[PDB]
Symmetry: none
C-alpha cells in the first residue's frame, strides 16, 4: 500500500545574539571578577549556538538543539538576560511567514525559537521517512508526537507570542496537524499488525478528527492570512485526507460487518467508503503522484470490496441495505499525545557550561 | 572528621491489582483475547515485586527507575489514571502515620516509586564514610539525585496524594538533600586545596540550605507531622548551621592571612570561635561522631585564633574590625536537584507493553 506524504515545518533562520559583552560586564559589575576570566565558557556557548542555528537536519541534530536550549536556561539562571533585565541584549530571528527580522531584548525569545526549531526538526524527521515497516511507522509517530510536544510547550509557556509564527492559533494548528500525522502512522501500523477491523475503524476515525481540527484553522480567514501561500498547499492535502481516512474508517466498518455476516450492512459501509473516497479523489487534483498512487490503490481495494459485497447481496443474501443514519457512528480512538520536553534534563545538556560562575 | 548525614525511609507498598483491569480493557476496546498479554502482565508483576522489596544498593536504584518507566509505558496504552476507565485501587502506607492511603490512580503508584527512589538515594548518600574524594563525589551525586526525585514529585504532583508528599514537606526534603550534597563538596574542596575564599563561599552555601530546612522544621505543621523526627532533624541541622558558619569564617580569616590583613584575620577567627561555641552548645547529646568533629575543629580554630591574636598584639598592631563590620560571605551554589526522566530508554529497557495498542 502506497503511503500518503506528510507535512513538515521549516526551521526558523537565526540572526545575531551578541551575549558576550553583556555577560562580561555583569561578571565585572555583579560577581566582582575579571571580565576576561570566562572567555572559555563564552567561547563554548558561542560554538554551541553556531552548531544549533546551523543544525544538521538529522536525528543527532535533535540533541544539539536540546543541549543548547538547556545551556540557555543555565545561563539565564546566572546572568539576567530576560525582558527588562540588566544584561539583556537584542535577539533577532526571522519570522517564517513574512521572512522579516523580528528582534526582542530577551533571552527567552532565543529559547523559544530554539524550541520551535526542535519541533520543526522532529516534524521533518517524521515526514522524510518512507514508513515501509512497523518500526518506521512507530519512529515517525514518535517524531510527530515530539513535534506536537515542542509546539504545545511553546504555546503553554510563551502565551504572549514573540512573532506570529509562534502565536497561539498557529501553534494550535501545528499541534493538531502533528497529532493527526502521528495517529495516521499508528493507523498504518494497526493494519500491519492485523488489529480487529472495528478498532482500525476507530483509529482512522480519530485521524479524521485531528485533521478536521487542523483544517478548521486552515479555513480560518485570519489564521490563513498569517500563513500566506503555504495555507493553500496544506489545506489541499489536509482536506483530501479528511475524506480519505473517513473512507478508510468506513472500509473497516464494512469489514467488521463481513465478519459478523451482516451482508446488507457490508454493502452500506462499502458504498459510503466509495462515496467518501471519490470526494478525496476530486480534492486531490494537482497533487503529487505519492497521493495519486495512494488513492488509486485504495480505489482498487474499496471498489473491489464494494462490487463483491453488492454481488453477494444481490444474488444470494438479498438483505436490506441499512440507511447509514441508522448505524452507530464510529467514535475516534485517540492513541497519541504531545510528548513533554524537559529543557534542563542533565542527560541532554551535559555539565552546566557556566558552573564556575558563582 | 565527617559529620553524620540524614536519610529518609522508604514507603511500604500495598496492593496494585492491575491485571484484571488490563485484561478487561483489552477485551472491550481492542476486541482481543484478554489472555493474549499474560506474558507482559507477568513481567510487570515481577518487576513490581522486585521494586517494592528493593535491595538497598546502587542496583536497587536501577530497579526503581526501570519499574517507574514501565508504569509510564503502561499508562500510555491503558487509561488507569484518576477517573479513567481501567483505573484500580493503589495502596501505600503513609510514612509518618503508618496509615494506609488509597487512590484509584496509577499516578499514585508512580509517585510512591519516585518517592522511594529519592529515599534510597538519601540512604546510599548517607551510608558512605566519605574517606576519599571518590566517596565524596558519589555521596554528593546521591544527595543531588535524592533532591531531584523529591523536586520532580513537588513539581508534577502539586496536589499531594498524602501528607508525606505535601509541597511543604517535599521542599524540606529537597533543601536537606541539597545542603548535604553541598556539604560533601565542601569536604572535597578542602581535600582539593581550593582557594580559601572559595572554600568559605562553599561553606556559607551549606549554611544557606540548612537555614531553609531549619525554617521548614520550625513550622508547627511540620512538627506535628514529623513528631520526634522533627526534633532529631532540627537539632542536627541547627548545629550544622553554626558549624558551617564557623568553617566559613575560618576560611575568610585564612584569606585575610593571605592578603596581610592581620586585624581582619583576628576578627574572622574570633567570629569563627563564637559560632563554633554555639555549635558545641547545640550539639549536646549528639554522638561522638559529632563531638569528635567539633573538638578537632575547635583545636584548629582555637590555634589559628591564638596565633593571629599573638601576631597582632605583639607585631602588626592593626585595628580589629567589629564583627558587625565583617562583610557577609555570599554562598556559592555548586549543587542542584538532578531530575529524572521517567522514560529514559537507558533506564527502562524495552517497552514491556510494546505489543499493546
Amino acid at each position: 500500500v502506497p503511503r500518503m506524504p506528510m507535512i513538515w515545518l521549516d526551521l526558523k533562520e537565526a540572526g545575531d545574539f551578541h551575549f558576550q559583552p553583556a555577560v562580561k560586564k555583569f561578571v565585572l559589575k555583579n560577581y566582582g571578577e575579571n571580565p576576561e576570566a570566562y572567555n572559555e565558557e563564552l567561547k563554548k556557548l558561542e560554538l554551541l549556538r553556531q552548531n544549533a542555528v546551523r543544525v544538521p537536519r538529522d536525528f543527532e541534530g535533535c540533541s544539539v538543539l536540546r543541549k543548547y536550549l538547556g545551556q540557555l536556561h543555565y545561563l539565564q539562571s546566572r546572568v539576567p538576560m530576560g525582558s527588562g533585565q540588566e544584561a539583556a541584549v537584542p535577539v533577532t530571528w526571522t519570522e517564517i511567514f513574512s521572512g522579516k527580522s523580528v528582534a526582542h531584548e530577551d533571552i527567552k525569545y532565543e529559547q523559544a525559537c530554539i524550541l520551535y526549531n526542535l519541533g520543526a526538526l522532529h516534524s521533518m524527521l517524521g515526514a522524510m521517512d518512507k514508513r515501509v515497516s512497523e518500526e518506521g511507522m512507530k519512529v515517525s509517530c514518535t517524531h510527530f508526537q515530539c513535534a506536537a510536544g515542542a509546539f504545545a510547550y511553546l504555546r503553554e509557556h510563551f502565551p504572549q507570542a514573540y512573532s506570529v509564527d509562534m502565536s497561539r492559533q498557529i501553534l494550535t494548528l501545528n499541534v493538531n496537524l502533528m497529532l493527526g500525522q502521528a495517529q495516521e502512522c499508528l493507523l498504518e501500523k494497526s493494519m500491519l499488525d492485523n488489529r480487529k477491523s472495528f478498532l482500525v475503524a476507530r483509529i482512522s476515525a480519530q485521524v479524521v478528527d485531528y485533521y478536521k481540527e487542523a483544517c478548521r484553522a486552515l479555513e480560518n480567514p485570519d489564521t490563513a492570512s498569517l500563513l500566506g501561500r503555504i495555507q493553500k498547499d496544506w489545506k489541499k492535502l489536509v482536506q483530501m485526507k479528511i475524506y480519505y481516512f473517513a473512507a478508510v474508517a468506513h472500509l473497516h466498518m464494512g469489514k467488521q460487518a463481513e465478519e459478523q455476516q451482516k451482508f446488507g450492512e457490508r454493502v452500506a459501509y462499502f458504498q459510503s467508503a466509495l462515496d467518501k473516497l471519490n470526494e478525496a479523489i476530486k480534492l486531490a487534483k494537482g497533487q503529487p503522484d505519492t497521493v495519486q498512487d495512494a488513492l488509486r490503490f485504495t480505489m482498487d481495494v474499496i471498489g473491489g470490496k464494494y462490487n463483491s459485497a453488492k454481488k453477494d447481496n444481490d444474488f444470494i443474501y438479498h438483505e436490506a441495505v441499512p440507511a447509514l443514519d441508522t448505524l452507530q457512528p464510529v467514535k475516534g480512538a485517540p492513541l497519541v499525545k504531545p510528548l513533554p520536553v524537559n529543557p534542563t534534563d542533565p542527560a541532554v545538556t551535559g555539565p552546566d557550561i557556566f558552573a564556575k560562575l558563582v
